[PDB]
Amino acid sequence: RGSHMLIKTLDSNILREVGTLSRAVNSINDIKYKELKLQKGQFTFLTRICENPGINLVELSNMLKVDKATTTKAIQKLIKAGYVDKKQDKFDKRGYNLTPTDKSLEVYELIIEEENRSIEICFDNFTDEEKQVVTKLLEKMSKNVENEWFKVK
Amino acid sequence: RGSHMLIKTLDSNILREVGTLSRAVNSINDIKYKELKLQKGQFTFLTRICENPGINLVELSNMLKVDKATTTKAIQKLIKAGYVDKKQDKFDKRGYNLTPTDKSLEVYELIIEEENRSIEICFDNFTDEEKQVVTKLLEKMSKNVENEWFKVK
């Protein structure tokens, strides 16, 4: 702490704000999901598996915009914790299909409840028009960075 | 892959979009910063240290909206890689002040260049008015989730 000033060399604050928002939501999700052992992004992988049963690790990486190594490590942990089953694919011998276990089906509703609670917090004091606007413009930002990720990966 | 439908139980797509955008930018930053050994958020901690020399681990955690354990692990790695020096604080015996090393001062400009390049990608095809709007509304979202993080942490 001291006397501060704006950073003149950074063209925009937009990614700092996106990092702040993202670290904050994940730090808070780390509190809620510690007891369930779903902290550090685990709940993210789980929801996608529940929403798309049979998805494979490659598809799951592409959906989440991370590399396969990240996905592999997270899937191993979720299997060990009994949230996911993997089965070798019938047609590609080194693919796996991911499926949710009976356990994770109860948690799924819990997770979605939590997401809607975080969503409500994000939108505190938003008008409906602001909601729509920011929703749409984030989509546009998202698609730009998606495109780049497919080129660069 | 198959035939899909919208998830009716999720009040909004906004945090999915924020996760997509954030994972994508970090996955891309993991490519650019692999050679410098600044992947997995390391470059984030480093920039804050360069921008605020003398900052301590507690302040740095609060600025980045993560818990102190995360910060400690990242700082240890950055010291080991020679990007940061830590010194015990004169007045709180178990605080440390973080400072950038000579090495990291060259990288800092590189990192900021990269951030401006990512920013440009995010804003591809944006009008000036859209830029301002999304910038402002993300700030508002950010502040809501900040508040909650201070309550819950």
Author numbering:
A (entry chain A), B (entry chain A): 16 to 168
Share the article's original sentences:
In this study, we solved the crystal structure of MarRC.difficile by molecular replacement. Diffraction data were collected to 2.3 Å resolution. We found that the crystal structure reveals MarRC.difficile to be a dimer, with each monomer consisting of six α-helices and a three-stranded antiparallel β-hairpin. In the crystal structure of MarRC.difficile there is one monomer in the asymmetric unit, with the dimer being composed of two subunits related by a crystallographic twofold rotation. Two helical regions, α1 and α6 (residues 9–27 in the N-terminus and residues 123–147 in the C-terminus, respectively), are closely juxtaposed and intertwine with the equivalent regions of the second subunit to form a dimer. The crystal structure also indicates that α-helices in the N- and C-terminal regions of each subunit interdigitate with those of the other subunit to form a hydrophobic core burying a surface area of 3100 Å2. The dimer is stabilized by several salt bridges, notably that between Arg16 and Glu74′ and that between Lys155 and Glu145′. In addition, a hydrogen bond between the side-chain carbonyl O atom of Glu66 and the guanidinium NH groups of Arg31′ enhances the stability of the dimeric structure. Structural analysis of MarRC.difficile indicated that two cysteine residues (Cys45 and Cys117) are located in the hydrophobic core; this may suggest that MarR in C. difficile is probably not an oxidation sensor.
Clostridium difficile is an anaerobic human pathogen that causes acute healthcare-associated diarrhoea. The MarR protein, as a member of the MarR family of multiple antibiotic resistance proteins, is a key global regulator in C. difficile. The transcription factors of the MarR family regulate diverse genes involved in multiple antibiotic resistance, the synthesis of virulence determinants and many other important biological processes.
